[PDB]
């Protein structure tokens, strides 16, 4: 199996949840912190 073509409809992933909840700002900040720090780079190198 091989992969061809070029990417279209480039929309990322996300963590869904209900409209009214108190976790939104903290969850977004934690995800951004994990991106900036370098944790996701370590995670990708092991599982994907």
């Amino acid at each position: 199996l091989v992969t061809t073509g070029e990417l279209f409809f480039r929309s990322g992933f996300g963590i869904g949840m209900r409209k009214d909840s108190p976790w939104k700002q903290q969850v977004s900040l934690s995800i951004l912190k994990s991106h900036e720090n370098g944790f996701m780079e370590d995670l990708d190198k092991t599982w994907v």
Binding site: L1, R10, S11, I15, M17, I31
Partner: protein
């Protein structure tokens, strides 16, 4: 939306049909769409 759960931590895409009801966090992985097709088998040296 039925109050059964509170988070959808999973591979959930982001578009406009969903974002009117639930609130998505910042993406933790970018991607797109891509075709996948089977590949053939190469040749050989035949009779030397």
């Amino acid at each position: 939306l039925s109050g059964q759960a509170d988070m959808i931590v999973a591979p959930l895409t982001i578009n406009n049909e969903r974002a009117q009801y639930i609130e998505f966090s910042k993406p933790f992985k970018y991607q797109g769409l891509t075709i996948l097709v089977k590949k053939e088998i190469p040749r050989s040296t035949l009779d030397s």
